[PDB]
Amino acid sequence: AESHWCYEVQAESSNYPCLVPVKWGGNCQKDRQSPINIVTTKAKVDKKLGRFFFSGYDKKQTWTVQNNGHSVMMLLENKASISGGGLPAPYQAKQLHLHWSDLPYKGSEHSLDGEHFAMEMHIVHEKEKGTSDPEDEIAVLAFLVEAGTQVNEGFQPLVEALSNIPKPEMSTTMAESSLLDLLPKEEKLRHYFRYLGSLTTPTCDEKVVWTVFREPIQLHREQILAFSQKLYYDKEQTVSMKDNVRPLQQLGQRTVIKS
Ligand SMILES: CC1(C)O[C@@H]2[C@@H](CO[C@@]3(COS(N)(=O)=O)OC(C)(C)O[C@@H]23)O1
Ligand SMILES: [Zn+2]
Numbered sequence: 380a381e382s383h384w385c386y387e388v389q390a391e392s393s394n395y396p397c398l399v400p401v402k403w404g405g406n407c408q409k410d411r412q413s414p415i416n417i418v419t420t421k422a423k424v425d426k427k428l429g430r431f432f433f434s435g436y437d438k439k440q441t442w443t444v445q446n447n448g449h450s451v452m453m454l455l456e457n458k459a460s461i462s463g464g465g466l467p468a469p470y471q472a473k474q475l476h477l478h479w480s481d482l483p484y485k486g487s488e489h490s491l492d493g494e495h496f497a498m499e500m501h502i503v504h505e506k507e508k509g510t511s512d513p514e515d516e517i518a519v520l521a522f523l524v525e526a527g528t529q530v531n532e533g534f535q536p537l538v539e540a541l542s543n544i545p546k547p548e549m550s551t552t553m554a555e556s557s558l559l560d561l562l563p564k565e566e567k568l569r570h571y572f573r574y575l576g577s578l579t580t581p582t583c584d585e586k587v588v589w590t591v592f593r594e595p596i597q598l599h600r601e602q603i604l605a606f607s608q609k610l611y612y613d614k615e616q617t618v619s620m621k622d623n624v625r626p627l628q629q630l631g632q633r634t635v636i637k638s
Contacts, residue, residue: 380404384581386449388622389612400626405582412628413576413589414488417635422572428465428638430569435459435472436558444540448547448612449580450623452476453537459558461504461518464590465573465638470504470518475558477501478579478624481607483526483600488579488624489591491523491572496595497603498524499624500561514575515588522562525595526603533560538602541609545616567594574635579625 384404385397398404435458443454455472462469479498480486487496502520506513536556543551559565570593577583610620 385612386623386625389618392618393613403581403583406577406585407581407583409577409583409585410629410631411576411585411633412583413579413587414490414625414627415574415576415630415635416490416493416627417572417574417591419492419572419593419637422635422637425465425573425636425638428571428573428636429463431464432462433459433559433565434461436562439555439557441555442553443550444537444544444553445550446544446547446610446620447476450476450478450620451537451541451544451606451610453553455502455558461520464518464571466518466588467515468507468509470506472558473503473505475500475502475561477524477606479524479603479606479621480624481604481621483603486603486622486624487523489521489523490627491591491593496523497526497598497600498596498606500524500596502558512586514586516586517578518588518590519578521589521591523592523595524598524603526600527597529597529599531596531598531602533562534598534602537561538605541605545609545611546614547612548614561596563592563594563596568592570594570638572635572637574630574633576628576633 453475457471459472485495487499504518536554572591607621
């Protein structure tokens with residue numbers, strides 16, 4: 380590759396050359412990529428997709444959050460884990476990060492019936508393997524964020540932290556908060572979509588079991604705008620961080636299922 384990967388917005392907003400998504404190397408040009416559009420009525424119900432069990436999601440922690448130049452990322456350090464959800468094993472939580480724009484009708488990586496949401500939050504987990512790498516080594520939990528006028532109090536520790544990490548490779552410590560503070564009510568997480576795909580940044584490894592929850596997180600417009608207002612892609616602060624979103628990939632021969 381002849382330069383570092385970037386999102387489209389970065390190449391459009393700066394004169395410094397970088398590799399846009401359609402030009403990404405690694406496995407990014409293979410045929411089981413993510414994100415995708417999900418046609419909700421065409422996803423077949425699979426009875427074996429039961430409720431998720433969250434561990435360590437309720438416990439208050441002071442999380443480390445950092446700007447890695449592509450997004451903001453909470454380091455979960457195996458301090459939380461998941462099971463159920465039609466998953467073959469329990470999975471350990473590694474990180475939480477987001478993708479967003481500054482318009483209410485875009486910012487999500489996945490789309491539901493052709494609608495993008497204002498943001499998409501990803502909680503990345505790793506498989507507890509046995510003896511006997513796989514297509515489902517990583518489980519990413521995806522939550523869509525809808526913009527409105529409801530102040531989401533649970534997001535406030537994260538939103539306030541953002542001022543402190545404007546430039547890449549900066550780290551800060553969030554005020555006391557839980558993962559559940561960031562999510563819809565647990566009982567509303569029974570309905571989700573499931574498919575097999577890839578990581579959405581290079582090298583786009585095809586090792587992800589995806590879950591996209593039907594229920595949106597409600598965040599105030601100004602809490603969403605805090606992300607593009609407070610963060611930058613570069614140490615020079617010439618390009619505000621937003622549209623950190625990979626364009627949609629074809630489902631191809633794959634199947635999307637739902638609980
Ligand atoms: C903050 C951001 C965007 O997310 C981090 C890191 C590199 O890319 C990721 C993307 O994970 S994803 N979007 O497929 O859930 O892939 C890994 C390596 C799992 O870490 C993710 O930058
Ligand atoms: Zn992501």
